[PDB]
Nucleic acid binder design. Structure first.
Lengths: 64, 62
DNA sequence: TAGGATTGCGCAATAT
DNA sequence: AATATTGCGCAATCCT
């Protein structure tokens, strides 16, 4: 049938579009993980640096 | 054909398994985002807390 | 009721 | 030989 073919073709085009977006969304999510992981490492270093800074300062005052 | 029957039966199982595996991997990656986002917020608050404590202590210098 | 978007699945060629 | 992967596509259901 001609009508049939037309209707199927439209959905097949829609399907490829939907799959492309989902796969792209996936790639984006993966990039987000790399970004968040980098930020996590930065924050961890910051927390450790400040914690040591604070600990040393507290020790000094305690000596008073 | 019986050989065709088992062929399709086994491949449909493998296809579904392969696709579920890919879906799980994607769902997992999505969980990492929610997980890293929450943790980063927690560490950021910790950074702010630590900075406030340092500031408080140093004021005692005056 | 119409039509695109989303989802799960089947098939068959092909990769492992 | 058998399982894993994937382009093409069907059909049901979701959503606007």
């Amino acid at each position: 049938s001609d009508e049939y073919k037309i209707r199927r073709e439209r959905n097949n085009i829609a399907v490829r579009k939907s799959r492309d977006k989902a796969k792209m969304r996936n790639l984006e999510t993966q990039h987000k993980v790399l970004e968040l992981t980098a930020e996590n490492e930065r924050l961890q270093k910051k927390v450790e640096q400040l914690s040591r800074e604070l600990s040393t300062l507290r020790n000094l005052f305690k000596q008073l």
